[PDB]
Design a protein around this ligand. Structure first.
Ligand code: NA
Length: 129
């Protein structure tokens, strides 16, 4: 599924991501934009041989099991394929664990490099929320 901007903002809010660990909804939409271009089926291989999955590019190195990431953990206790669903419940549940891990949204290098400190409210501008 390729979400629309205000459609994803609505889905995230409904699953309790807005102001989770103090991160406004525009932070989460901005992260999704640059991680996946709002595509639930996005996958990308890391140099280390782990893979990032879904709207928030959650990494098999720590958070999900893909069966091909030697020495990795599965701290969200999900198959990585669950993170490619059109329903973002699994991605949001797992993202709550990630942003709680100590470094907040810095876990998402594209959030740090492209969203952090920017006018993230622009991402939910005009959305009926
Ligand atoms: Na893993």
């Amino acid at each position: 599924k390729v979400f629309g901007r205000c459609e994803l903002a609505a889905a995230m809010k409904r699953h309790g991501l807005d102001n989770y660990r103090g991160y406004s909804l525009g932070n989460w939409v901005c992260a999704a934009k640059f991680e996946s271009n709002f595509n639930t089926q996005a996958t990308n291989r890391n140099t280390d041989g782990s893979t990032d999955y879904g709207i928030l590019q959650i990494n098999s190195r720590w958070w999900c099991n893909d069966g091909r990431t030697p020495g990795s953990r599965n701290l969200c206790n999900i198959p990585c394929s669950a993170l490619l669903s059109s329903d973002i419940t699994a991605s949001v549940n797992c993202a709550k664990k990630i942003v709680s891990d100590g470094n907040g949204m810095n876990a998402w290098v594209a959030w740090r490099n492209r969203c952090k400190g920017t006018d993230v409210q622009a991402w939910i501008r005009g959305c009926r929320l």
